[PDB]
């Protein structure tokens, strides 16, 4: 193992932050979501963890953000997914073109996150993700391989398990491009809620007959 080694650890590392709730500060809350800024550690900044309960089963949650089959199709900040080098059946690497731009101070990014999908028995169905510097894909200046250090995306069965699920995501992005403190204050908090919005909308895109607005071919 190799990709698994770091990711398999990174799963419980990012999840390790789901169970490490302190030393941070909510930067962004609405009425069901909670972005809390702590520390990136793998970057001279801070990490952002968003937390929202989506009234659905963690199954449909892990059904929408799964990989390349609708994730980027019905989303708002997603563009293109390319399955670069999958290590096993639960350890992938994503070439994800993202639209994570704060209106104008940011250009679209290329996310090469090595991603490990883990199901903690009725506890969490997380996809971990590490912006991994693997040779199967080099980015460009038009698309900046976003350095999303060992982050992830955990979906936790709540007390109402199939009825309500705990969507919690962490990211300690490097923003190695030309952004300023206040841009990043916009880029991370607003993107995490938006990853939950994709969840709110993608979940009902899956659940509700809201496929009448079929945006892009889900499976091409």
UniProtKB/Swiss-Prot annotation:
Gene3D superfamilies on file: 3.30.530.20
Taxonomy, superkingdom: Eukaryota
Full protein name: StAR-related lipid transfer protein 6
UniProt entry tagged with the keyword Transport: yes
SMART domains, A to Z: START
UniProt keyword annotations, A-Z: Lipid transport, Lipid-binding, Transport
Keyword Transport appears in the UniProt entry: yes
Function description: May be involved in the intracellular transport of sterols or other lipids. May bind cholesterol or other sterols.
SUPFAM superfamilies, per the entry: Bet v1-like (SSF55961)
Organism: Homo sapiens
């Amino acid at each position: 193992m190799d990709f698994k080694a770091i990711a398999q650890q990174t799963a419980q590392e990012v999840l390790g932050y789901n169970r490490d709730t302190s030393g941070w500060k909510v930067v962004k809350t609405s009425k069901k979501i909670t972005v809390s800024s702590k520390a990136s550690r793998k970057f001279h900044g801070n990490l952002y963890r968003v937390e929202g309960i989506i009234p659905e089963s963690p199954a449909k949650l892990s059904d929408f953000l799964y990989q390349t089959g609708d994730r980027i199709t019905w989303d708002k900040s997603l563009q293109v997914y390319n399955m670069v080098h999958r290590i096993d059946s639960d350890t992938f690497i994503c070439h994800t073109i993202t639209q994570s731009f704060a209106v104008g101070s940011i250009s679209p990014r290329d996310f090469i996150d090595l991603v490990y999908i883990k199901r903690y028995e009725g506890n969490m169905n997380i996809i971990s993700s590490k912006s991994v510097d693997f040779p199967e894909y080099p980015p460009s200046s038009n698309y900046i391989r976003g350095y999303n250090h060992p982050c992830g995306f955990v979906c936790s069965p709540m007390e109402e398990n199939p009825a309500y699920s705990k969507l919690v995501m962490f990211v300690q992005t490097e923003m190695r491009g030309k952004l300023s403190p206040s841009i990043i204050e916009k880029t991370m908090p607003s993107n995490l809620v938006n990853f939950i919005l994709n969840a709110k909308d993608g979940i009902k895109a899956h659940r509700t007959p809201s496929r009448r607005g079929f945006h892009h071919n889900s499976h091409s």
